[PDB]
Design an enzyme around this catalytic site. Structure first.
Site, PDB file in Angstrom:
ATOM      1  N   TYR A 135      -0.762  -0.703   6.939  1.00 47.83           N
ATOM      2  CA  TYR A 135      -0.201   0.064   5.841  1.00 47.83           C
ATOM      3  C   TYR A 135      -1.210   1.089   5.347  1.00 47.83           C
ATOM      4  O   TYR A 135      -2.417   0.831   5.310  1.00 47.83           O
ATOM      5  CB  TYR A 135       0.228  -0.845   4.679  1.00 47.83           C
ATOM      6  CG  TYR A 135      -0.922  -1.403   3.870  1.00 47.83           C
ATOM      7  CD1 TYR A 135      -1.595  -2.544   4.282  1.00 47.83           C
ATOM      8  CD2 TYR A 135      -1.326  -0.793   2.690  1.00 47.83           C
ATOM      9  CE1 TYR A 135      -2.644  -3.057   3.546  1.00 47.83           C
ATOM     10  CE2 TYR A 135      -2.373  -1.298   1.949  1.00 47.83           C
ATOM     11  CZ  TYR A 135      -3.028  -2.430   2.381  1.00 47.83           C
ATOM     12  OH  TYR A 135      -4.072  -2.937   1.642  1.00 47.83           O
ATOM     13  N   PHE A 141      -4.767   5.787  -1.889  1.00 48.24           N
ATOM     14  CA  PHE A 141      -5.536   4.777  -2.602  1.00 48.24           C
ATOM     15  C   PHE A 141      -5.863   3.545  -1.773  1.00 48.24           C
ATOM     16  O   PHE A 141      -6.807   2.829  -2.121  1.00 48.24           O
ATOM     17  CB  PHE A 141      -4.798   4.330  -3.876  1.00 48.24           C
ATOM     18  CG  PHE A 141      -3.473   3.668  -3.618  1.00 48.24           C
ATOM     19  CD1 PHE A 141      -2.324   4.423  -3.462  1.00 48.24           C
ATOM     20  CD2 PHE A 141      -3.377   2.288  -3.542  1.00 48.24           C
ATOM     21  CE1 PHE A 141      -1.105   3.815  -3.230  1.00 48.24           C
ATOM     22  CE2 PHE A 141      -2.161   1.676  -3.308  1.00 48.24           C
ATOM     23  CZ  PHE A 141      -1.025   2.441  -3.152  1.00 48.24           C
ATOM     24  N   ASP A 142      -5.125   3.275  -0.699  1.00 51.20           N
ATOM     25  CA  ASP A 142      -5.384   2.102   0.124  1.00 51.20           C
ATOM     26  C   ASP A 142      -4.907   2.372   1.543  1.00 51.20           C
ATOM     27  O   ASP A 142      -3.959   3.131   1.757  1.00 51.20           O
ATOM     28  CB  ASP A 142      -4.693   0.857  -0.441  1.00 51.20           C
ATOM     29  CG  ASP A 142      -5.270  -0.430   0.112  1.00 51.20           C
ATOM     30  OD1 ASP A 142      -6.197  -0.360   0.943  1.00 51.20           O
ATOM     31  OD2 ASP A 142      -4.793  -1.514  -0.285  1.00 51.20           O
ATOM     32  N   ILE A 163       2.801  -7.172  -3.885  1.00 50.83           N
ATOM     33  CA  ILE A 163       3.787  -6.607  -4.795  1.00 50.83           C
ATOM     34  C   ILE A 163       5.171  -6.744  -4.171  1.00 50.83           C
ATOM     35  O   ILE A 163       5.370  -6.479  -2.978  1.00 50.83           O
ATOM     36  CB  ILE A 163       3.449  -5.142  -5.121  1.00 50.83           C
ATOM     37  CG1 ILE A 163       3.117  -4.362  -3.846  1.00 50.83           C
ATOM     38  CG2 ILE A 163       2.288  -5.072  -6.103  1.00 50.83           C
ATOM     39  CD1 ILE A 163       2.932  -2.873  -4.074  1.00 50.83           C
ATOM     40  N   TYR A 190       2.939  -2.272  -9.802  1.00 51.15           N
ATOM     41  CA  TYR A 190       2.047  -2.664 -10.888  1.00 51.15           C
ATOM     42  C   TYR A 190       2.623  -2.350 -12.264  1.00 51.15           C
ATOM     43  O   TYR A 190       2.198  -2.958 -13.253  1.00 51.15           O
ATOM     44  CB  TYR A 190       0.691  -1.983 -10.707  1.00 51.15           C
ATOM     45  CG  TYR A 190      -0.089  -2.516  -9.528  1.00 51.15           C
ATOM     46  CD1 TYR A 190      -0.638  -3.791  -9.553  1.00 51.15           C
ATOM     47  CD2 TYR A 190      -0.268  -1.749  -8.385  1.00 51.15           C
ATOM     48  CE1 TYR A 190      -1.348  -4.284  -8.477  1.00 51.15           C
ATOM     49  CE2 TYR A 190      -0.976  -2.234  -7.305  1.00 51.15           C
ATOM     50  CZ  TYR A 190      -1.513  -3.502  -7.356  1.00 51.15           C
ATOM     51  OH  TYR A 190      -2.221  -3.992  -6.284  1.00 51.15           O
ATOM     52  N   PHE A 225       4.144   4.029   0.763  1.00 44.89           N
ATOM     53  CA  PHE A 225       3.444   3.286   1.800  1.00 44.89           C
ATOM     54  C   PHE A 225       3.957   3.700   3.171  1.00 44.89           C
ATOM     55  O   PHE A 225       5.164   3.822   3.376  1.00 44.89           O
ATOM     56  CB  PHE A 225       3.635   1.777   1.624  1.00 44.89           C
ATOM     57  CG  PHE A 225       3.011   1.223   0.379  1.00 44.89           C
ATOM     58  CD1 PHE A 225       1.643   1.044   0.295  1.00 44.89           C
ATOM     59  CD2 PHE A 225       3.796   0.867  -0.704  1.00 44.89           C
ATOM     60  CE1 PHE A 225       1.067   0.529  -0.850  1.00 44.89           C
ATOM     61  CE2 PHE A 225       3.227   0.351  -1.850  1.00 44.89           C
ATOM     62  CZ  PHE A 225       1.861   0.182  -1.923  1.00 44.89           C
TER      63      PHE A 225
END
Ligand SMILES: Nc1ncnc2c1ncn2[C@@H]1O[C@H](COP(=O)(O)OP(=O)(O)OP(=O)(O)O)[C@@H](O)[C@H]1O
Lengths: 675, 290, 107, 175
Positions: free
Chosen positions: C26, C36-37, C56, C82, C99
């Site tokens: 991902y 961010f990731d 999540i 979140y 994502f």
């Protein structure tokens, strides 16, 4: 009649190959017509009428057919390679012959000025056989195609020399010195300027054998090649073709920007004045100005004044007051995006870049059409339309943006203008004004507000999102489109193989070897540069170095949660690229090394250094097998190598993942590829 | 203090400068220039194909870039206009280029998802048909012979257009321009001419870098200055007017003799080189009733 | 809650069953496009077990709707993410997450 | 010499090289006698010499008031020394460059050429460092010449020539 040009003749499509300029036309039809033409003209001459040509002219078109904004390009070495002492040599091979100059430039040399036209550079121009430094003189001779110019600088004796194919060039006198005296200053770097349709090559002598005339003139005079003592290729900088918006300099020759404070009865103002008006060489060309911070529209579009309405609204306003004496027809007011880079002497609202993306259902049936552009502006002259008195007040055009709906509207004088714009969601709009100076006072950005509309500073700054009082913080300022900028040529390019497999298979383009660069993004300006360009941008370099220091500080001394958070902003590919790259600036290199150490290694390193001076040795057979010396020959082994059985802290790391909700990963430092 | 500063500064990503690794992106175009103007001899509709022999979705941690489409110039200059020349940006990342990536139409660095039968990103063995109509500004795409339900229109046509492909590392693609430069896998739409027909008679078709500088040695790299505008790209024949001028009588009754003399020239010429009477009109028989 | 768009088709037949482990790659981006990731950044595929509140739930249900070998773009609203409190230091409050997820394996 | 300097440089000619030393001896005689300047100012007025008819004529062959308009740079002797120094300099080696360096140093110190000969002969044995990258790449570029080494070059006569050329440069530049 309807015919067009085609590589092959086709009656049905009315294509012929003969519809080409006469210069490119084939000879067969050319001579077929020319034979009858010659017969006709000779018959005219024979019948008694003598024909004489009107005149013969010898005029040069100056081969200036390039873009009007680019007459030459300047290629120079990086500023960090400036030499302040010693003897240095480099070569310049001229593939063509024309308006080319070569020499040494100071670090402050501007890319949009001719080499040697000012004090910032010393150049030799072989097109006219001249030397250029703060003026023009006669020096040397004119080269031809393929000539190699060897440039020598002696910073010990403050001299410069030029050789053509190994022969030392001379000035009007017999002096070999191109420039007899000059201050060292900040040093000199190799530089060249190439005009329209000119091709050059600059050799710094990294491979001495590649130099052509160094041995003939320069090897034995003590002159060193400019890149002899280098294990890395010299970085190239060159003039930037695409103009960019930058803050108006305080020492600009033409434009002055005045920040006017906002009183209780007035609003903050940023006034643009043409300080050079009414004098020699006053810049009469149109100039493009913008505000340093954009308004960002909503991500998703929904399908006296009232305080509640102001608090709940997403409509922002500014105004531009074209002063009396400045013709409104020469002023444009509105919004631009970060994609605007169109510097043209003649600007019209009908020539802005635009496109329409049309999306339809499976069988035609267009269900949406989106107009995309980078210039949403209106003309003050057409806003005025009927000729007004031009003395009642300055022409105050008010721009209103509704970010919740992406609607751009304009007010001429209390009246809503017919022109309006609709923008796509998430668009960033910069308040921009395009003006041609027809008076010392051109216009001013007025940052007030009108009824039921939120002030512009609120949409600009998140802290003042609910502050109806208009403000002009120091971050907001006036930038102008300019060409005084440099571009950094990448040290490595993608290796692309292009070939022709066959007639049927077409043309093959292949690329396999990955190549990456580290991109620095400016949030307010919505523009990204290469982080390697910070070698010549001091303020950004210093701020980013202190940002890395803050990154280390926030996670210093075992703040594992902060380290995990920082792993989102600086990932391990970025860390590896920063530590491996050889062209990265020293400050950023040290900062990124420290960041890597503090994020991924500092905690366990400190724990081991803390248990360093204590020896808890368990008893096992492994401990019993330990000996002072590896063999009978009592020679010390390599320190660290051997079987060590003393107890040591356990090494544990947690995977940094921001999709998990475990919350137990905040123990231990984030993982890193240790091998 | 550490937690407060982190939580109140880092997540915004609006003040501190942001860092990210970006794959280098390079562009390739044929040496073809397409334009539309009043009085020009250029055709208005063009067609070409790009077929992907191989692609790697993730050569690096960042997704592989591969877009195909059309790019325009900035007012008759040979340079691709309005875009950077080093890397990071490709087709559709400026308002001078219009690209397709198999799922999205790209223009002005903005992507719109577009419907298609069995939507997928550009992959191995994919044939892309690009059509450009300049009479009514339109750019259309067809994936594997299936229409793409998205379209570019009403763009600036004051420059020169050319086919273009932008890509990062990890691809093998092949341009098919028709004729002897790659047979089309699909029949072009009616009225659209193959892109190989735009080559001027003197020049030769090539596929080359969209920008001037490529991977070479430092001392072998050619530094180029500004380049002249392509006036030859648009052929607008404007002759010297003859309505304002007047034929004098003496030139007229000598024009009679000139016309008879040149008529004699053509007729006697067709005697010596072999024209004669012909009952039926045919090109091969090479005969004229003159 | 989650909005899914296929980038590369999968087999179309094998879907994550209950009590199974999804191994995916991902890349996480904010709705403005900032990353961010990314598991591909770390070179280690992300493994998560279905129905145990390990990620999540927007990502949970998106990967559940995914098929074996499929690549897809997943849009998660803050309600399935979140939310208003957000992730301190990484995810701002009320942020829609995007994502790029490839379902490598089901084990 | 301007027609054949490139032949003499690409292919060294020891027979033609003696001309360099010979015109250097002419130059030291020019240094000795001060009367050349006065008689030359007289000779130029008596029989009209401007050196321009040789300065601006040689370019075609190589295919590459009175007080203010008259200069001395067109003098044949100085022109010859400029056109003939490079061949002798190419005879000189990068290793011999240091020998020329300290010869000029002792000339600046005003030590006589008789004394410096034995000093340089003794210092010949003390060879320079060899592994250093600078000097290593100078003899890397100098090794193309097969028999230009100090092993084949006679020591004492080359030392005397080095002192002579050091005096030549001494006078020419700094006196
Ligand atoms: N009988 C002929 N013999 C030789 N050449 C001919 C003959 N008829 C036509 N041509 C040539 O073939 C071409 C056809 O032109 P033609 O004489 O028919 O005049 P046109 O109809 O005005 O066309 P164009 O403008 O191309 O000359 C010309 O290049 C002409 O020289």
């Amino acid at each position: 009649q309807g015919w067009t040009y085609g590589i092959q003749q086709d009656v049905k499509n009315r294509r012929n190959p003969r519809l080409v300029p006469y210069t490119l036309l084939d000879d067969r039809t050319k001579k077929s017509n020319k034979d009858s033409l010659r017969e006709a003209v000779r018959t005219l001459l024979g019948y008694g009428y003598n024909l004489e040509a009107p005149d013969q002219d010898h005029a040069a078109r100056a081969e200036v057919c390039s873009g009007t904004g680019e007459r030459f390009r300047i290629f120079r070495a990086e500023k960090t390679y400036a030499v302040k002492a010693g003897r240095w040599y480099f070569e310049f091979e001229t593939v063509t012959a024309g308006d080319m100059r070569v020499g040494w430039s100071r670090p402050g040399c501007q890319p949009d000025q001719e080499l040697g036209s000012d004090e910032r550079a010393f150049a030799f121009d072989g097109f006219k056989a001249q030397r250029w430094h703060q003026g023009n003189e006669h020096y040397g001779r004119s080269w031809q195609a393929g000539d190699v110019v060897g440039c020598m600088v002696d910073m010990n004796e403050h001299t410069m020399m030029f050789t053509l194919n190994g022969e030392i060039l001379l000035d009007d006198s017999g002096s070999e010195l191109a420039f007899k005296d000059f201050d060292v200053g900040d040093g000199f770097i190799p530089v060249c300027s190439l005009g329209v349709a000119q091709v050059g090559r600059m050799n710094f002598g990294k491979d001495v054998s590649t130099l052509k005339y160094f041995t003939i003139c320069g090897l034995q005079e003590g002159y060193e090649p400019f890149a002899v003592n280098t294990n890395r290729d010299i970085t190239m900088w060159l003039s930037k073709r695409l103009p960019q918006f930058l803050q108006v300099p305080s020492n600009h020759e033409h434009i002055e920007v005045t920040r006017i404070d906002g009183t209780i009865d007035s609003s903050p103002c940023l006034k643009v004045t043409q300080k050079s008006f009414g004098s020699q060489n006053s810049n009469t060309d149109i100039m493009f100005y913008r505000l340093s911070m954009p308004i960002e529209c909503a991500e998703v579009f929904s399908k006296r004044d009232d305080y509640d309405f102001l608090m709940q609204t997403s409509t922002y306003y500014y105004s531009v007051r074209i002063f009396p004496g400045q013709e409104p027809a020469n002023v444009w007011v509105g919004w631009i995006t970060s994609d605007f880079h169109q510097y043209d002497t003649g600007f019209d609202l009908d020539r802005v870049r635009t496109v329409t993306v049309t999306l339809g259902d499976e069988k035609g049936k267009v269900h949406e059409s989106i107009k995309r552009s980078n210039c949403y502006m209106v003309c003050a002259g057409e806003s005025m339309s009927p000729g007004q008195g031009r003395n009642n007040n300055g022409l105050e055009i008010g721009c209103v943006v509704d970010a919740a709906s992406g609607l751009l509207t304009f007010i001429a004088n209390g009246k809503e203008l017919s022109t309006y714009y609709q923008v796509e969601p998430s668009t960033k709009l910069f308040p921009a004004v395009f003006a041609q100076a027809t008076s010392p006072n051109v216009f001013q950005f007025e940052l007030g507000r009108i009824k039921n509309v939120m002030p512009l500073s609120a949409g600009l700054f998140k802290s003042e999102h609910k502050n109806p009082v208009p403000q002009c913080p120091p971050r907001l300022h006036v930038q102008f489109l300019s060409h005084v900028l440099w571009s950094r040529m990448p040290n490595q390019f993608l290796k692309v193989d292009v070939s022709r497999i066959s007639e049927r298979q077409g043309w093959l383009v292949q690329c396999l070897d990955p190549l990456q660069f580290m991109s620095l993004h400016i949030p307010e300006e919505n523009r990204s540069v290469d982080i390697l360009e910070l070698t010549e941008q001091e303020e950004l370099l210093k701020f980013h170095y202190h940002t890395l220091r803050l990154y280390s500080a926030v996670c210093a001394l075992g703040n594992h949660r902060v380290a995990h958070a920082l792993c989102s902003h600086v990932d391990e590919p970025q860390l590896l690229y920063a530590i491996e790259n050889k062209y990265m600036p020293g400050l950023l290199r040290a900062g990124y090394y420290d960041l890597l150490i503090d994020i991924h290694l500092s905690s366990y390193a400190t724990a081991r250094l803390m248990m360093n001076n204590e020896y808890i040795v368990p008893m096992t057979e492994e401990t019993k097998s330990i000996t002072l010396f590896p063999d009978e020959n009592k020679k010390h082994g390599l320190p660290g190598i051997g079987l060590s059985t003393s107890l040591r802290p356990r090494m544990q790391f947690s995977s940094p993942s921001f999709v998990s909700i475990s919350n137990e990963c905040y123990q231990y430092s984030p993982e890193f590829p240790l091998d | 203090n550490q937690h407060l500063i982190c939580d109140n500064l880092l997540p915004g990503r609006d003040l501190l400068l942001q860092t990210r690794l970006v794959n280098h992106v390079s562009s390739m175009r044929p040496n073809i220039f397409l334009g539309v103007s009043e009085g020009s001899a250029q055709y208005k509709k063009w067609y070409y194909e790009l077929m992907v022999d191989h692609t790697e979705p993730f050569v690096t941690a960042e997704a592989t870039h591969l877009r195909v489409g059309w790019a325009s110039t900035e007012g008759y200059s040979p340079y691709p206009g309005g875009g950077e020349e080093w890397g990071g940006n490709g087709v559709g990342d400026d308002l001078f280029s219009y690209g397709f990536d198999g799922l999205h139409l790209w223009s002005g660095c903005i992507a719109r998802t577009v419907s298609s039968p069995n939507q997928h990103l550009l992959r191995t063995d994919d044939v892309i048909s690009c059509c450009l109509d300049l009479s009514a500004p339109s750019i259309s795409f067809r994936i594997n012979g299936q229409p793409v339900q998205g379209m570019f229109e009403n763009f600036n046509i004051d420059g020169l257009f050319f086919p273009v492909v932008s890509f990062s590392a990890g691809i093998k693609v092949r341009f098919l321009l028709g004729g002897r430069h790659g047979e089309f896998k699909f029949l072009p739409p009616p009225g659209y001419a193959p892109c190989y027909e735009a080559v001027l008679p003197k020049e030769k078709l090539k596929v080359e870098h969209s920008r001037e500088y490529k991977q070479e040695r430092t001392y072998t790299r050619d530094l180029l200055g500004p380049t002249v505008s392509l006036t030859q790209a648009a052929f607008t024949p404007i002759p010297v007017d003859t309505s304002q001028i007047v034929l004098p009588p003496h030139l007229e009754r000598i024009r009679e003799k000139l016309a008879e003399n040149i008529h004699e020239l053509w007729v006697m010429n067709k005697i010596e080189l072999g024209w004669q009477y012909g009952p039926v009109r045919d090109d091969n028989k090479r005969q004229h009733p003159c | 809650g989650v909005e899914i768009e296929t980038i590369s088709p999968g087999d179309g037949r094998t879907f994550p069953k209950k009590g199974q482990t999804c191994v995916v790659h991902y890349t996480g981006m904010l709705q403005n496009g900032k990353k961010f990731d990314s598991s591909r950044d770390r070179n280690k595929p992300f493994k998560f077990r279905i129905g145990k509140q390990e990620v999540i739930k927007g990502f949970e249900e998106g990967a559940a709707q995914m098929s074996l070998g499929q690549r897809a773009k997943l849009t998660c609203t803050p309600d399935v993410a979140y939310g208003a409190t957000g992730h301190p230091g990484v995810i701002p409050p009320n942020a829609t997450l995007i994502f790029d997820v490839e379902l490598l394996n089901l084990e | 010499v301007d027609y054949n300097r490139a032949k003499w440089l690409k292919e060294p000619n020891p027979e033609a090289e003696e001309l360099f030393r010979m015109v250097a001896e002419v130059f030291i005689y020019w240094s000795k006698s001060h009367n050349f300047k006065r008689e030359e100012q007289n000779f130029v007025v008596q029989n009209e010499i401007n050196n321009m008819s040789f300065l601006i004529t040689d370019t075609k062959s190589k295919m590459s008031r009175k007080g203010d308009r008259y200069s001395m740079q067109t003098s044949l002797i100085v022109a010859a020394l400029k056109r003939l120094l490079p061949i002798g300099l190419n005879i000189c080696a990068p290793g011999d460059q240091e020998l020329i360096a300290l010869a000029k140093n002792r000339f600046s110190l005003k030590d006589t050429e008789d004394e410096v000969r034995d000093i340089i002969r003794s210092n010949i044995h003390l060879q320079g460092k060899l592994e250093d990258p600078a000097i290593r790449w100078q003899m890397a570029l100098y090794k193309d010449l097969p028999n230009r080494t100090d092993d084949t070059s006679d020591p004492e006569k080359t030392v005397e020539r080095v002192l002579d050329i050091a005096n030549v440069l001494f006078h020419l530049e700094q006196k």
